[PDB]
C-alpha cells in the first residue's frame, strides 16, 4: 500500500533498522518503526466458471423447425439467412438439418 511521509510527502519504502523494520523516506530523516503486525489483503477474483456447453438445446434455440431441405427433407432443422453482399442481388441462406443426424450445410 502507498504510505507517504508527513514531512515532505514522498513515497515511503520499507527497510530494516537496528531494532525494527522501518518505513523510511528517501529524502528526509523520517522513519516509522513497525512495532506491531500490519497487513494489506488483496482479495483477488476466483475462477468462478466451469462452463460446460454444446448441448443440443443450446443448438436448437433458433426459430426454424419442420421445414424442407433439398437433401434429406427432415423436420428438425437449424436455419440461417444472410444478405450482406449486395453483389448478390438474390438472397442468401444456409441450412442445418439434424433429425436423422445427417448434417447437411448448403446454400
Amino acid at each position: 500500500m502507498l504510505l507517504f511521509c508527513p514531512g515532505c510527502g514522498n513515497g515511503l519504502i520499507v527497510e530494516e533498522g537496528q531494532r525494527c523494520h522501518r518505513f523510511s523516506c528517501n529524502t528526509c530523516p523520517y522513519v516509522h518503526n513497525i512495532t506491531r503486525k500490519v497487513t494489506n489483503r488483496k482479495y483477488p477474483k476466483l475462477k468462478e466458471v466451469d462452463d460446460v456447453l454444446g448441448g443440443a438445446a443450446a443448438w436448437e434455440n433458433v426459430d426454424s423447425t419442420a421445414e424442407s431441405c433439398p437433401k434429406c427433407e427432415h423436420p428438425r432443422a437449424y436455419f440461417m439467412q444472410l444478405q450482406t453482399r449486395s453483389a448478390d442481388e438474390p438472397m442468401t441462406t444456409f441450412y442445418k438439418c439434424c433429425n436423422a443426424q445427417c448434417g447437411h450445410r448448403w446454400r
Binding site: M1, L2, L3, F4, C5, P6, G9, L12, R19, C20, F23, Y30, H32, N33, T35, R36, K37, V38, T39
Partner: protein, 186 residues
C-alpha cells in the same frame, strides 16, 4: 526439486487452517517498550485518502447547507470560520468610487448590515442581498488543512503574522437565473 508431488482426498479442517494462519503472523516483538522502539501517535504516516489517514490505530454521505447551518447553531454554540464564494458582481452601485457600470465587489461597499440569510422549508437556502436573493450551495468539500492568517505590515521592513483559526467548509453563492429571467422574459 522432486517433481512428483503426492496428494490426498482428506478434507482440510477450517479451524486447522485458521490456527495455522493465526500462528504464522500473530507473533509480536512489541515487548521493547523503549524510546527508539516507541512511536509518536501524532506523526503517523499518511494513508492517501485524506479523510482515511489512519492506517495504524490504537486498537461517507454529503451534507447540505441547511444541515451545515443547523449543526453550527443548534448542536453547538461554538463559532466556525467559513469560506464563501460570491458572484462576480454584487448588485450595487460603487458608492462615490469614480466608476461605466463596472464590477461591484466587497472592496467597494461599507461596513454595516449587507443583507439577510433565509433558510427556507425543505432545505432551500437563499441569500437576500437587497432586492435580489442569491442562492447558496455547498461547494466541493475540502479535507486538507486551511489556516486563516492576518499579515500586518506595521512597519516598512517588519510586521506581525497571526493565525486566526482553521477553515473547514466552503460555501458557493450564485445568482438565481430562473427568477431573474422570469421577471421579464425574452
Amino acid at each position: 526439486r522432486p517433481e512428483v508431488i503426492q496428494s490426498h482426498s482428506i478434507f482440510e479442517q477450517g479451524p486447522a487452517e485458521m490456527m495455522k494462519k493465526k500462528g504464522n503472523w500473530d507473533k509480536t516483538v512489541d515487548v521493547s517498550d523503549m524510546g527508539p522502539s516507541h512511536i509518536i501517535n501524532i506523526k503517523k504516516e499518511k494513508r492517501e485518502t485524506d479523510e482515511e489517514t489512519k492506517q495504524i490505530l490504537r486498537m461517507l454521505p454529503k451534507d447540505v447547507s441547511v444541515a451545515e447551518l443547523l449543526r453550527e447553531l443548534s448542536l453547538t454554540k461554538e463559532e466556525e470560520l467559513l469560506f464563501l464564494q460570491l458572484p462576480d458582481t454584487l448588485p450595487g452601485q460603487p458608492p462615490t468610487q469614480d466608476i461605466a457600470e463596472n464590477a461591484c465587489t466587497l472592496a467597494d461597499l461599507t461596513e454595516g448590515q449587507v443583507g439577510k440569510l433565509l433558510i427556507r422549508k425543505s432545505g432551500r437556502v437563499q441569500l437576500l442581498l437587497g432586492k435580489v436573493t442569491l442562492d447558496v450551495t455547498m461547494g466541493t468539500a475540502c479535507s486538507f488543512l486551511q489556516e486563516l492568517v492576518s499579515v500586518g505590515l506595521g512597519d516598512s521592513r517588519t510586521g506581525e503574522m497571526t493565525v486566526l483559526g482553521h477553515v473547514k467548509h466552503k460555501l458557493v453563492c450564485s445568482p438565481d437565473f430562473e427568477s431573474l429571467l422570469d421577471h421579464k422574459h425574452r
